[PDB]
Design a protein around this ligand. Structure first.
Ligand code: CHL
Ligand code: CLA
Ligand code: CLA
Ligand code: CLA
Ligand code: CLA
Ligand code: CLA
Ligand code: CLA
Ligand code: CLA
Ligand SMILES: CC1=C(/C=C/C(C)=C/C=C/C(C)=C/C=C/C=C(C)/C=C/C=C(C)/C=C/C2=C(C)CCCC2(C)C)C(C)(C)CCC1
Ligand SMILES: CC1=C(/C=C/C(C)=C/C=C/C(C)=C/C=C/C=C(C)/C=C/C=C(C)/C=C/C2=C(C)CCCC2(C)C)C(C)(C)CCC1
Ligand code: SF4
Ligand code: SF4
Ligand code: SF4
Lengths: 31, 55, 732, 194, 35, 80, 95, 166
């Protein structure tokens, strides 16, 4: 059974939020 | 007049960012298929099984 | 000045391209940064650890997502032995139609890569069955990675940022890591195995939906709390048990059968659950050793202080080492790397012989790839451990504080250690190479019976002690005495079935070729250790350069005076030892791969015949097994091994380019760049564009590193391509 | 003045001078001073076109004319090539005049701004509702009003995506509050540097 | 639908677009004068 | 630039000064040695780091030492 | 009940053992072995405020100062011994 | 006065100023004052939510609307869970954002009574969850079974008899 498109896009949006948080951590490290 | 708004560097930065987004979207949606790339065309062939009968 | 070396003024004002290179290179060397306090050092290290842990979890979530989305995990689970795992879909615009039609393996409708990382066998063994389970896991690890990124961000704020003393609290950290990071984690994994992985292995799917409704054992927790723990081992899985089905499926959740599950040729999952449970108990007990906040426990400083040999053979004992370890981040890093590299070697050496994952032993390419992976990682980690110890000796070692302890004693008899390392290395290399050359000549001269074939009777005697009945010593487990009688209650029938079988690699038969290659391995380990220990102990100074500690860890040289001092730094000792590390690891994994290929074709006699002389390795292993690899693409089309052929040649390219940086040195290249600067400055229509940074040749240390990196990259990629392509061409 | 959430901090270059300024620019697209009037005028244009589009979609739908997505295929007096030539010429002339006027250069302004903003949201809604359900805006509204509890975006084919996005929106300002009270708010980088 | 669309978009996004922006951005920062 | 240090073991043989290709080193009066003179490094900014002074120093261990540090144009020895 | 008798008895036995036999030795050892110290001073004395010693560890009316942490340590030991005995006994019975 | 008998002396960071202060910080979590205040607010919140949860569960079970509270999510209200999250998250985000801004902007007997009943409700909710896990009867029914057969129905027996009632 393949993954539903909603599943893929929800995981991808969670990834986008994780990436935002990674940018926040990188900026905080750079200070 | 043809380069009226582009004389600013940051205007060029916006142009190139938008162009990058539109070209990648169009390539992944329509451009690749239009160019008849082999990757976009399906395998359209019977598959082969590796040794130890491993598909 | 520029902003990129924000942490280095001295690099910010550098007017050359060396600025960019050294700002890249010295970015993670926090200790040498401008205006860097110890508190900022420790906080930044803590947040970087958070960061790359989040990187690890995102990598795992990515693997899970790609297997769930583009893989064939369900179909592979249906037929594990006749389905090639899928790693991820390929969308390459550069592929031709034959490439698209040749990379479509598995049941994919798109070009794919065949997952050689074993993640399929691992995820099938832990109870994951469907793409939905893998997707749920990937999403959960995405959330975990976001949580750790937020935690790093939070503990970088001044309110939540911890002081130095929080990091220096050794007792609390080790108590919590032993009990909770190790022990409770192992307990939770046991709970997973008992509740999910074992029932999934016996056919019933236990997910969160039907979790809390299906008891993992027919009896509840009554046998647990009433102390009748042997009820959980009452009815193990039958020998004729098919994995993932209920045929011959037992009810026991925890046991110590030993050996391997006959249908999967891997460890019994009940054994591995009982295993993680026992570890959990031992480590939870162990994590109460040290004293934190409750008036009980040991003090590590006083443990070290009281362990001094009364006769004074060790000097002042360990007096003063607690502060040495705790204040030295490089000492701790060297210890952690040493241990981690030993563990990685142990994983390589235990996963091939004791496969913990169902249907992993039958997939030979994955076994070879995993062994090579972990051995090369282990060798690099070992080189790092020794390098960081040299760094500890330079930056963090205090001779006044460490006066009289074992460490200062190491400094005092360093010459003896280095000289005996040189002796053992010279003996091993002389005699191993001589025996190999002798065997080469005897085979060449048509008289192979005159070869010096030393039977490795000591390793064979160990195997006989451990249950192997081939050689006939029959002493400890092969014989009939007290040790075997004690063993024959729980584990030993399965262990003896596993070890005396010709199919598995639990304890392979040993011959004179195995003798010679293990002595080659010993040569490699002794020589790499020679170079690295020499670098560490002469890091602070030697007779050629007494004041080496004043020049830092990594400097080019001390000039051509005093005869010449090229490669005199401890960094340069590391750089030299990485070559020997790559050489040794290659020897080990060549041995592994050839012995296993002979086993997998069913003719172990090939290795046992041709491993005693170097031409046999060059012909019957390298030349013989490179045939299908180099034929990945040719004028008559291409096949699925064309990518590995391209990577093989790719790694050859990188290896050679590395040779350029290693052999030719800076000063030829500097003058060449000077002529190029003149040319660009005097070229019409090109002088309109001018460099911001003055172009200069790579510095001596930089280029030594660049060449070493190219050497190692080409080494690893060439061998990865070889070990995967040959094994997949012969076995899939 | 009220910002884009209770407790928000307006960017320093968003001081309420422009119409509809709610201090919303997380990605700092209008941070550059010289492009900010251009971005204002891009907002006003996209809003105006969305307003005209919303009117021409809703009236067309409610008057029984062909559906907005189907309206291209209808048989018109002029074929595609001549129509696009007409469009190219007249819109080029009109946009040249608009550009030169822009180069030359309260209540009602704010009104227009808000209206355009709603329109762009409403037009995106119409396109998304058609792409997901295949129902025109008035049909989609009737379907929603028939069964409001279960017929919605968050129960459609992209339902979980929308639920996750609304969760992100609901949990963003709380994290921004932590960032303000714990961090110094001294970011040297902007999400769009140019 | 994800399988037929997302690879053809994200492979150029990660292998041509993101590299270009990242290299340009890093260049602009590294060559950015300290003041 | 680099760092050049002169230590009191210097005998004032002047060989470091004569060996310097950028005129970094000079001899100054000093009562510590028999010869009555110690080297010094006033023009440290001009030190390319070639370490000819260390090669020409007879004293064991060296009385002049060059420690490579921040690299400037002059230290890198660039004509461009 | 067999498990209850052997277990409770064992745990209490271990508690008593800690209270009288090895209590003087344990207290002498914690006197001899000071609090953990970093750079010559305790973690709390060096700034680790989270290494502040607890207060309930001395609030005890026991003649020998058998605090709550001593109770928990010796009860753990007794539980480990008892469950080892139960587990071993079950092996000897049914295996 | 204190969670331990009279020769117990509270740690310094718990001086008794807050309501329901019995000097129970054996781990020393509330040593930092600003974190102690954040934890005071977190206790108040988790407590109030535990009270609401226990009161709602007992109401729905005694009056019989929803027995076996744990499957209330599966029950059909006509309004599916996805849109329920979609409407809850904005409203609850608004309420919690307003509350936290109020908290950051800033009778003792009543406050002490509240905090004590909160700690009790926290314990009660934990007990409800674990009993529901191990016994699969509703809380009031679990109470009734304990009253009828205290030695036949308790943790030391329900753990012994998971397989027979599940
Ligand atoms: C805002 C501008 C704009 C948008 C969103 C669309 C959107 C669309 N047009 Mg296009 N169009 C647009 C401008 C124009 N279209 C056309 C002429 C057509 C035709 C003739 C058709 C479309 C169709 C379509 C669809 C794509 C398949 C989609 C609904 C097709 C469709 O869905 O109709 C069934 C179609 O047949 N468009 C003209 C006249 C030159 C336009 C002028 O600007
Ligand atoms: C580190 C883990 C990892 C790795 C190595 C890969 C690798 C790949 N992915 Mg996958 N992916 C991952 C995680 C990962 N992914 C996760 C967590 C998601 C979200 C669920 C996705 C979602 C995803 C989709 C939807 C698609 C791919 C695609 C691809 C392929 C190339 C195009 C690309 O890079 O777009 C990746 C797309 C992104 C939007 C970025 C996702 C990457 C994660 C979230 C961040 C990883 C960052 C890393 C740890 C640190 C980077 C810093 C530095 C080292 C460079 C390639 C096989 C495409 C493919 O199969 O082409 C054939 C494709 O269509 N990926
Ligand atoms: C129960 C309490 C607890 C737990 C769980 C942790 C957990 C962690 N701490 Mg520690 N820490 C604690 C208390 C705790 N801490 C206390 C009290 C203090 C104050 C003294 C600290 C101070 C502290 C510091 C200063 C740092 C950490 C760090 C870390 C992280 C290290 C990464 C890691 O786990 O490697 C993974 C390791 C394991 C899971 C255990 C290793 C076991 C061996 C090597 C492998 C065996 C694996 C096994 C065979 C299965 C493998 C195969 C399978 C995957 C297929 C980790 C999440 C580091 C960090 O910043 O990370 C964010 C760090 O720098 N901690
Ligand atoms: C947990 C592990 C760990 C940790 C925390 C550190 C941390 C540190 N190390 Mg140690 N080290 C480690 C592992 C570790 N290392 C290992 C395993 C090795 C052996 C390889 C080394 C070898 C080593 C040396 C020799 C030195 C350090 C140094 C340092 C410090 C600075 C690193 C630096 O210069 O910037 C970051 C480093 C880089 C950016 C360089 C990375 C370049 C890589 C090799 C390129 C690789 C190419 C890539 C894989 C190819 C892609 C594929 C291809 C197909 C395209 C820092 C304290 C340096 C120092 O000054 O110490 C105080 C130093 O001299 N370490
Ligand atoms: C195949 C290549 C090769 C070989 C044979 C050696 C051999 C040796 N290296 Mg070198 N090395 C190499 C490559 C090699 N290295 C490379 C590429 C690197 C990276 C730079 C290093 C880096 C390196 C370091 C950094 C160190 C070594 C050390 C050693 C010695 C290890 C001890 C040993 O095995 O003794 C056995 C010796 C040999 C096998 C050497 C050849 C001896 C031959 C067989 C005898 C010849 C007799 C015959 C009559 C000759 C006829 C000639 C006639 C015409 C005169 C040994 C001399 C270590 C050392 O000095 O330890 C004491 C050490 O510190 N090497
Ligand atoms: C010139 C020829 C060429 C080119 C350009 C490509 C390009 C590609 N191939 Mg193809 N391929 C080729 C030849 C080529 N291939 C040949 C001859 C073969 C043999 C038949 C293959 C076989 C093949 C397979 C089997 C696969 C590909 C895949 C890919 C894609 C990688 C996805 C990606 O962008 O990840 C992002 C890029 C990387 C992860 C590379 C990282 C390497 C760097 C140098 C590491 C160090 C980074 C460092 C931090 C610096 C970063 C700077 C940054 C800021 C710019 C890409 C489109 C894969 C694919 O389509 O999956 C999606 C795939 O699975 N190719
Ligand atoms: C707080 C909280 C807690 C402790 C639980 C606890 C549980 N939920 Mg509920 N749930 C909550 C909030 C919570 N939920 C909210 C806000 C929603 C959205 C309205 C739901 C919607 C929901 C559904 C739809 C389901 C659960 C289910 C469950 C069980 C798993 C468990 C009893 C499952 C269940 O009832 O299992 C029988 C289930 O199917 N929950
Ligand atoms: C306000 C506190 C409180 C009260 C009044 C009750 C009352 C009850 N519980 Mg609950 N319970 C509580 C807290 C509480 N429990 C907590 C904190 C836990 C988690 C360990 C549990 C876990 C629990 C389970 C697992 C079960 C009960 C059961 C019961 C009933 C049997 C008698 C008993 O307590 O034995 C249980 C006693 C304990 C678990 C000891 C600790 C109780 C508190 C802390 C004192 C009874 C109605 C049983 C039932 O259904 O009948 C049952 O199966 N409780
Ligand atoms: C430089 C330096 C450093 C580092 C170093 C190193 C890196 C080392 C390594 C080392 C190593 C790496 C080691 C290893 C070891 C091992 C061991 C020690 C082992 C053992 C074993 C045993 C003991 C066993 C026994 C047995 C057997 C035989 C089998 C069976 C089982 C049993 C158990 C019985 C440091 C930082 C520290 C310091 C400074 C300097
Ligand atoms: C009142 C009083 C008294 C009495 C007292 C007593 C008697 C007390 C007790 C106490 C007790 C009685 C305590 C106990 C404790 C216990 C504990 C604390 C437990 C623990 C446990 C554990 C830790 C476990 C672990 C484990 C598990 C979990 C399973 C596995 C195995 C093992 C076992 C390892 C007298 C008269 C003298 C005096 C006066 C006062
Ligand atoms: S590295 Fe090149 S320059 Fe530096 S000493 Fe050795 S040879 Fe002379
Ligand atoms: S430094 Fe060496 S060379 Fe220069 S003067 Fe003193 S001694 Fe003579
Ligand atoms: S290094 Fe070269 S330049 Fe600097 S002092 Fe010694 S000799 Fe003169």
């Amino acid at each position: 059974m393949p993954l539903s498109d909603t599943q893929v896009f929800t995981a991808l949006f969670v990834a986008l939020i994780t990436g935002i948080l990674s940018l926040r951590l990188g900026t905080q490290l750079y200070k | 007049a043809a380069a009226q708004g582009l004389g600013r560097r940051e205007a060029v930065y916006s142009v190139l960012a938008v162009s990058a987004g539109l070209l990648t979207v169009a390539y992944g949606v329509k451009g690749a298929k239009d160019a008849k790339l082999p990757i976009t065309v399906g395998p359209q062939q019977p598959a082969q099984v590796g040794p130890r009968d491993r598909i | 000045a520029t902003k990129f070396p924000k942490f280095s003024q001295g690099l910010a004002s550098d007017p050359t391209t060396r600025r960019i290179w050294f700002g890249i290179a010295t970015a993670h060397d926090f200790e040498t940064h401008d205006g860097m306090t110890e508190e900022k050092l420790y906080q930044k290290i803590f947040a970087s650890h958070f960061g790359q842990l989040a990187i690890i979890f995102l990598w795992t979530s990515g693997n899970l997502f790609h297997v769930a989305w583009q893989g064939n995990f369900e179909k592979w689970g249906e037929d594990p032995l006749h389905v090639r795992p899928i790693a991820h879909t390929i969308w390459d615009p550069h592929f031709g139609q034959p490439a698209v039609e040749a990379f479509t393996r598995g049941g994919a409708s798109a070009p794919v890569n065949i997952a050689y990382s074993g993640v399929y066998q691992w995820w099938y063994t832990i109870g994951m069955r469907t793409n939905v389970d893998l997707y749920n896991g990937s999403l959960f690890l995405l959330f975990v990675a976001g949580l750790f990124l937020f935690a790093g961000w939070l503990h970088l704020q001044p309110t939540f940022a911890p002081a130095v003393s929080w990091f220096k609290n050794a007792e609390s950290r080790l108590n919590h890591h032993l009990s909770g990071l190790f022990g409770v984690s192992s307990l939770a994994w046991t709970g997973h195995l008992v509740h999910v992985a074992i029932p999934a292995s016996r056919g019933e799917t236990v997910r969160w939906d039907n979790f809390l409704t299906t008891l993992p054992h027919p009896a509840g927790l009554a046998p647990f709390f009433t102390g009748q723990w042997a009820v959980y081992a009452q009815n193990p899985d039958t020998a004729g048990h098919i994995f993932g089905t209920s045929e011959g499926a037992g009810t026991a959740i925890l046991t110590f059968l030993g050996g391997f599950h006959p249908q999967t040729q891997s460890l019994w999952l009940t054994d591995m659950a009982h295993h993680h449970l026992a570890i959990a108990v031992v480590f939870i007990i162990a994590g109460h050793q040290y004293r934190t906040n409750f008036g009980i426990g040991h003090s590590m400083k006083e443990i070290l202080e009281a362990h001094t040999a009364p006769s004074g053979r060790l000097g002042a004992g360990h007096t003063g080492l607690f502060d040495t370890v705790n204040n030295s981040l490089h000492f701790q890093l060297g210890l952690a790397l040493a241990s981690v590299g030993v563990l990685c070697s142990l994983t390589a050496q235990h996963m091939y012989s004791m496969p913990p994952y169902a249907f992993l032993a039958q997939d030979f390419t994955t076994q070879a790839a995993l062994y090579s992976h972990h051995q090369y990682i282990a060798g690099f980690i070992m080189c790092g451990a020794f390098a960081h110890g040299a760094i500890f000796f330079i930056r963090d070692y205090d001779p006044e504080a460490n006066k009289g302890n074992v460490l200062a004693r190491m400094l005092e008899h360093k010459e003896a250690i280095i000289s005996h390392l040189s002796w053992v290395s010279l003996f091993l290399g002389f005699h191993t190479l001589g025996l190999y050359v002798h065997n080469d000549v005897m085979q060449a001269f048509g008289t192979p019976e005159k070869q010096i074939l030393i039977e490795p009777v000591f390793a064979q005697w160990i195997q006989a002690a451990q249950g192997k009945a081939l050689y006939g010593f029959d002493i400890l487990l092969s014989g009939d005495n007290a040790a075997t009688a004690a063993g024959n209650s729980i584990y030993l029938p399965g262990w003896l079935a596993g070890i005396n079988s010709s199919t598995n690699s639990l304890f392979l038969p040993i011959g004179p070729g195995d003798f010679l290659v293990h002595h080659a391995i010993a040569l490699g380990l002794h020589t790499t250790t020679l170079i690295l220990v020499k670098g560490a102990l002469d890091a602070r100074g030697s007779k050629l350069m007494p004041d080496k500690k004043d020049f830092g860890y990594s400097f080019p040289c001390d000039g051509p005076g005093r005869g010449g001092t090229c490669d005199i730094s401890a960094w340069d000792a590391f750089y030299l030892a990485v070559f020997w590390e790559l050489n040794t690891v290659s020897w080990t994994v060549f041995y592994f791969h050839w012995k296993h290929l002979a086993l997998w074709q069913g003719n172990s006699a090939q290795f046992d015949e041709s491993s005693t002389y170097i031409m046999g390795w060059l012909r019957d292993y390298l030349w013989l097994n490179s045939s299908q690899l180099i034929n990945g693409y040719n004028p008559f089309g291409m096949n699925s091994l064309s990518v590995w052929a391209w990577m093989f040649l790719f790694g050859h390219l990188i290896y050679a380019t590395g040779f350029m940086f290693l052999i030719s040195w800076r000063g030829y290249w500097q003058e060449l760049i000077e002529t190029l600067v003149w040319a660009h400055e005097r070229t019409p229509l090109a002088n309109f564009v001018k460099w911001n940074d003055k172009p200069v040749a790579l510095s001596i240390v930089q280029a030594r590193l660049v060449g070493l990196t190219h050497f190692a990259v080409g080494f690893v990629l060439t061998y990865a391509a070889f070990v995967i392509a040959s094994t997949s061409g012969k076995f899939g | 003045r009220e910002l884009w959430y209770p407790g928000a901090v307006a960017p320093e270059y968003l001081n309420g001078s422009m119409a509809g300024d709610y201090g919303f620019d997380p990605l700092r697209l209008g941070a550059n001073v010289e492009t900010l009037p251009y971005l204002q005028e891009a907002e006003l244009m996209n809003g105006r076109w969305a307003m005209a589009a919303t009117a021409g979609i809703l009236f067309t739908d409610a008057t029984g004319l062909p559906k907005w997505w189907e309206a291209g295929a209808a048989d018109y007096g002029y074929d595609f090539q001549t129509l696009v030539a007409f469009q190219v010429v007249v819109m080029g002339v009109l946009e040249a005049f608009r550009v030169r006027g822009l180069m030359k250069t309260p209540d009602k302004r704010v009104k227009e701004v808000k209206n355009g903003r709603l329109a762009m949201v409403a037009f995106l809604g119409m396109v998304s509702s058609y792409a997901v359900t295949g129902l025109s805006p008035l049909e989609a509204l009737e379907a929603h009003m028939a069964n409001p509890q279960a017929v919605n975006l968050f129960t459609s084919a992209v339902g979980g995506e929308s639920v996750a996005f609304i969760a992100f929106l609901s949990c963003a300002p709380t994290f921004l509050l932590a960032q303000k009270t714990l961090g110094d708010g001294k970011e040297e980088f902007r999400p769009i540097p140019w | 639908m994800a399988a037929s669309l997302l690879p053809s978009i994200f492979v150029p996004l990660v292998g041509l677009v993101f590299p270009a922006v990242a290299m340009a951005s890093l260049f602009l920062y590294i060559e950015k004068e300290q003041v | 630039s680099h760092a050049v240090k002169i230590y009191d073991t210097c005998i004032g043989c002047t060989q470091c000064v004569r060996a310097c290709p950028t005129d970094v080193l000079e001899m100054v009066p000093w009562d510590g040695c028999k010869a009555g003179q110690i080297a010094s490094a006033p023009r440290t900014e001009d030190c390319v780091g070639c370490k000819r002074c260390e090669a020409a120093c007879p004293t064991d261990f060296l009385s002049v030492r060059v420690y490579l540090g921040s690299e400037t144009t002059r230290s890198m020895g660039l004509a461009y | 009940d067999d498990v209850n008798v052997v277990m409770s008895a064992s745990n209490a036995l271990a508690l008593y053992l800690g209270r009288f036999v090895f209590l003087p030795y344990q207290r002498a050892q914690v006197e001899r072995v000071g609090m953990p110290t970093q750079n010559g001073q305790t973690h709390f004395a060096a700034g680790d405020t989270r290494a502040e010693e607890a207060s309930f560890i001395t609030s005890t009316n026991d003649p020998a100062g058998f605090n709550l942490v001593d109770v928990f340590a010796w009860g753990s030991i007794g539980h480990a011994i008892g469950f080892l005995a139960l587990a071993s006994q079950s092996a000897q019975q049914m295996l | 006065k204190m969670w331990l008998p009279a020769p117990y002396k509270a740690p310094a960071h718990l001086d008794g100023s807050i309501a329901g202060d019995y000097g129970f910080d054996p781990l020393g979590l509330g040593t930092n004052p600003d974190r102690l205040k954040y934890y005071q607010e977190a206790e108040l919140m988790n407590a109030r939510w535990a009270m609401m949860a226990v009161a709602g569960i007992v109401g729905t079970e005694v009056a019989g609307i929803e027995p076996r509270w744990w499957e209330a999510g599966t029950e059909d209200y006509g309004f599916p869970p996805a849109a329920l999250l979609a409407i809850q998250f904005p409203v609850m985000g608004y309420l919690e954002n307003k509350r936290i801004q109020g908290w950051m902007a800033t009778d003792a007997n009543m406050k002490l009574k509240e905090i004590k009943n909160g700690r009790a409700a926290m314990i009660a909710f934990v007990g409800i969850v674990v009993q529901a896990i191990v016994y699969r009867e509703g809380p009031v029914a679990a109470l009734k079974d304990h009253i009828s057969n205290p030695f036949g129905c308790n943790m030391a027996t329900n753990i012994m008899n998971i397989p027979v009632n599940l």
